[PDB]
Amino acid sequence: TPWSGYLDDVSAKFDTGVDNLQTQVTEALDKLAAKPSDPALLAAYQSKLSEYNLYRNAQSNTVKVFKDIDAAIIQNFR
Amino acid sequence: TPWSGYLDDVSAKFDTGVDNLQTQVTEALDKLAAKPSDPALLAAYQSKLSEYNLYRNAQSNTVKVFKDIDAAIIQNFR
Amino acid sequence: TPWSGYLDDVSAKFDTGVDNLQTQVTEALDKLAAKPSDPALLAAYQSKLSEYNLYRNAQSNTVKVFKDIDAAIIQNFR
Amino acid sequence: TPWSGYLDDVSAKFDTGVDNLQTQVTEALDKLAAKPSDPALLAAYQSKLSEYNLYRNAQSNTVKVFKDIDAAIIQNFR
Amino acid sequence: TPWSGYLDDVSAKFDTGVDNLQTQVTEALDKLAAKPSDPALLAAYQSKLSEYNLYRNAQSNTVKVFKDIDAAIIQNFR
Amino acid sequence: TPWSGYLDDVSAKFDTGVDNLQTQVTEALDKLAAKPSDPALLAAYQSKLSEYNLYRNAQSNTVKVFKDIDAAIIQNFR
Amino acid sequence: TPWSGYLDDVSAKFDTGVDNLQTQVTEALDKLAAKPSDPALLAAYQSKLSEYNLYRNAQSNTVKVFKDIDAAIIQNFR
Amino acid sequence: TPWSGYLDDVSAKFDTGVDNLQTQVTEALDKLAAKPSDPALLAAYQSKLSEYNLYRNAQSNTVKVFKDIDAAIIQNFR
Amino acid sequence: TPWSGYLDDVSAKFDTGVDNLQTQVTEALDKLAAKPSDPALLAAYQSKLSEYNLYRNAQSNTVKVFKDIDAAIIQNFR
Amino acid sequence: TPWSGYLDDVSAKFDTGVDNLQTQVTEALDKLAAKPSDPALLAAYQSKLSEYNLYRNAQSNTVKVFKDIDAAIIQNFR
Amino acid sequence: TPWSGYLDDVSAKFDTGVDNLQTQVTEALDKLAAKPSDPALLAAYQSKLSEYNLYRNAQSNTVKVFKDIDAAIIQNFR
Amino acid sequence: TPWSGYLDDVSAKFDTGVDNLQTQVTEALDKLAAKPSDPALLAAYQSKLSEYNLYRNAQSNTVKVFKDIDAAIIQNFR
Amino acid sequence: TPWSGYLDDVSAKFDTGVDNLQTQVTEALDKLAAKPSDPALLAAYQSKLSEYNLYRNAQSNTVKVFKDIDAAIIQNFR
Amino acid sequence: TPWSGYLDDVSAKFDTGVDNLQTQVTEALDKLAAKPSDPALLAAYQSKLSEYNLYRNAQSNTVKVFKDIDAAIIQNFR
Amino acid sequence: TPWSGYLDDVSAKFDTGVDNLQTQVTEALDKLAAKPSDPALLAAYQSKLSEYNLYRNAQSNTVKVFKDIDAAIIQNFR
Amino acid sequence: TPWSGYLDDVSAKFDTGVDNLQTQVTEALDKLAAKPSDPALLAAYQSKLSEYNLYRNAQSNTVKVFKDIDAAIIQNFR
Amino acid sequence: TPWSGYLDDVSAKFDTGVDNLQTQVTEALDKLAAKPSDPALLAAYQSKLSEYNLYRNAQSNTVKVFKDIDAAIIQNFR
Amino acid sequence: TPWSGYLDDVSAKFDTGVDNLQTQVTEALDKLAAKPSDPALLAAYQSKLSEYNLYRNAQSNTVKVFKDIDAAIIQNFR
């Protein structure tokens, strides 16, 4: 079993919270790259890519805050 | 069950809001391509295609706004 | 009763200040998705969506300022 | 009964002063990780996380001051 | 009473400024569709439709400007 | 008498510098909404609205600079 | 009568120096939360909030300096 | 005296530059509407209307450029 | 073997997704330049060129988004 | 050797694709100007001139599209 | 003699570099407003206005860069 | 005569070094607030405000350094 | 000597490139207005007017392109 | 020998990469200004000008990216 | 067997408490250096590196405190 | 053999992790500068340059973090 | 001979490392201010100004680091 | 042979432990000062300078500790 600290648990709640968004973006890209002119594939890939962008930004900026909550507590040990 | 975020729900409200506009445009194109000289088929395909254009533009520009509402909130985490 | 700090009160003043803007945007989207070609539904949804964008941006950037007012006071404890 | 000194009492006044902020941040993270694109979940998680940051900073910098009040009195015993 | 923000008030000044232009275009269309060969109905419907086009364009581009005035002020909070 | 700090004085110099631009835009909108097809009302409202846009942007970006001049001086107290 | 030391007097000179800035920010927030799209309410709340930020930072960093002037004198008793 | 900014002065240079073109178009329309078959009235109204079209287009596109010169300077304040 | 990062893989999925669209546009141009008056060559070159335009725009705007997803994560390292 | 970019190569494929259409139009004009009443010279010059018109329009509108494909890629560098 | 810092000297090099472009635009506007239908006045005013636009944009964006060169040096004093 | 220490002399060298920059910014603001659409007033106020920002930052960060040079010498008395 | 920027030089290359086309159109109009029934004057005025139309369109659309080349470079200063 | 940094080398690779495109555009303009009605000169000048536009845009946006690669490394020195 | 004092035991509790965080950071760096554009590798390396930073800071500041607890006891021997 | 510390090893893992990205960007620039109008060269250079940007940012921000991990340990020696 | 410490030598290595970049920026500004519409002068001034920005930032942030290396050694004298 | 005490041996273990870091920083500065815009020279100089900073801080804080170990033993002679 690999070790997971608290920032790993905060980061992996977004990983387990979305089910297969990492797959659905790669699947919708492979459908779009086969035919980049279908409106139904562009509108589906816009929605999946614009959610993967907000997924990664929320999952990164949350880890950045809890790292700043912790580093300001460890600063007060000494 | 495939995962659906909030931009998927906003995009699929237009998908479920129109019933079979994705079908009616493809059906009216197949009737028009068989006979591209009937005024009744041209006038019916003009109406269906000009609604599919506004369908896709509204469904795309709405996802683009809610992606900008969200990305300016996630910007304020840190 | 759930706990509410000062940034919750600042954030919920915008929530209680608008009455049902969270509802009126979802209602106007459901009317627009049923018929994305009516000018009266597009002009009503433009106004509601452009107010929900300014609602969320003002409600987020205000919380961000009061969080920076507070964190610069707590910095001066030690 | 576990022993609690004076710095434990100062630290646990913040723990008992907030009711369930340690829970509400973990609950709002679990709601946000399931859907990191809802503006209502981002705006609620911004407020809860920005209060948990000020909670921990005030609860840490207060313990640090009272530890410096005490260590400068114990310095004057000898 | 439904909530109305400032962009709703700017949009509804055009709605209340014209009296029944939303009705007069629908009435003139119903008179024209019954007989699309009368010059008096075509010349009356041209005038009503060409005013409804300028009505919607002015009512939309004004909301778009005041949304850009506001979003550049909210940008300067932080 | 309400209190006015230095950023209030900088903001209200633009308010007192224009005489009744806040009125002239609302007056020209009410004349335009009554008849959104007159070229003389559109050309007068374009000029008033394009000045109100530059009025608010200059009045906001100036307050933002003097707030950054001050916050970098208060940073140097400690 | 509650006791007030010298750092209370330095802190309350800023409290009595501004008249009702603690009120004017809460009043301007309540006007802005009712309508977060009025440029006149955003420009007035920007000025009041950007003064309350400099008010609290100056009132905190001044107390921090006089606490360091005093603690370096009390250090020289022994 | 009503206030006039710089875009008002640029717009009113076209207003004062033509003398009574706003009158001469309305006068030539009233002469043409009384008799829309005189070649001398049609040829005079063609010239006046085709100058009023270029008058309004030049007076509008000039205000639009100077509004873009200014907004790109105010962008560089911050 | 040349190195390929993740943006190379996203860009080359469009390259491998279309088979020989880079060839079919150059072949249809060489057939059209030999005879730019055949309707069958113009209608075939319109379809191929209008797909190569959407191919390059989708393949470029996708790389631009994933470059912005990544640069906002690398921003949060420090 | 003069330099030739990609738009030069696209433009010169039409130049090399037609053999001597730039010559055949000038030759057929010189034969027609010597005798502008021969039906065989008018019918031959109609065909050559109507092909030179479609030659230049296709050769110009193709360069215009590839210039818009490129400028939207260079837009995504930054 | 009025004081001139380095950003004044950078801004006034554009002012002294053009001779009377601030005059030539106002002169060409006064000639165009007297007759907004002369092609020779429109083509001369297009050239003067399109140079005044690039004059102000270059003169503003240069001051903005040297202000950012300086503010990043003054940041390194402390 | 008011007393002036060494940090007063360092701070007032910037005050006497600029002649009337405290006046020229207030004069250029009063000219800009009367007409916030003139490019010549915006470009002059950009230069004056961007110099007043660097004036105050250099005059503050220099006092902050000499206060740290001195406080580390007074630390070595005992 | 009047100042001439680069767009003046591009515009005046067309002015100096044609010799007296501005004169020859005015001369051919004065000959045609004296007798608007001579085929030799109509055929000469058709050729001169149809060249003055292409002269002004090429001289205007070239200035418009070089103004867009420049404004996209000045955009990249900051 | 004049000094050339890395952004000079990136900018001058486009300068040396095209041979005489700066000359060929000025030569094709001088041929077009002498006769702005020849289709062969318009079609040759369209190709040269549309390549000079993409030349300058690529040469500018590349320098802008490498300036942003460098400024984010120099940011990490301190 | 190497000797381990009490500060070694406090330091090695963090070493044995994390399992292979010293390995997982080096493994995630080697995966990221092979492809520094994958969002899944950047988001995984952000979490591992931000935990290794808090690991080392907590493991260092704890040893620093227990070294100060001990040195103030050994000071009281004599 | 040149000396390499730990930050050299962290920096050179990105150097050895990409194979010849420092070469492929310089090769793709030399191909693009020879012809800055080919869509295939622009789309290949966009991908290589957007990966070199993320390469340098990740390789710089990682060295910056490990320098801050180390400097906070060396701070705890004394 | 003026005295030069080690930070003077570090600062003047950038001064002697660039040859005449302080001159080439002032020369390119004087050429650009004479004609702020030439693309060749804008593209040359963009490259020189964007190198002078990185010159001053690297030359300032390096002096700032070596001043922090030294001040942390002089801190350890006592 | 110059005399070397124990603190000289502790200080010179860092001097002999790094091979030519005192040279590699001076060599990388001389390469960077010749061209302060190359990303490869900035990224190499960042790594060398950030190691020279940790080299000097570790080599200074170690001498400071062993000087405090010794001075507390010499204190116990009498």
Residue numbers in the entry:
A (entry chain K), B (entry chain E), C (entry chain J), D (entry chain P), E (entry chain D), F (entry chain I), ...: 3 to 80
Quote the study's own text.
The core component of this machine is the envelope-associated needle complex, which consists of a multiring base, an inner rod, and a needle filament extension that protrudes several nanometers from the bacterial surface.
Even the closest structure of all 10 SSNMR models reported shows a difference in the twist (63.35° in our model versus 64.00° in the SSNMR model), which although relatively minor, leads to accumulating differences that ultimately results in noticeable variance in subunit packing. Consequently, the overall fitting of the two structures is poor. The reasons for the observed differences between the cryo-EM and the SSNMR structures could be due to structural differences resulting from the different assembly mechanisms (i.e., in vitro versus in vivo) or differences strictly related to the methodologies utilized to determine the structures (i.e., cryo-EM versus SSNMR). To clarify this issue, we solved the cryo-EM structure of in vitro polymerized PrgI needle filaments. We found that the structures of in vitro polymerized needle filaments is virtually identical to the structure of in vivo assembled filaments attached to the base structure, exhibiting equivalent helical twist and rise.
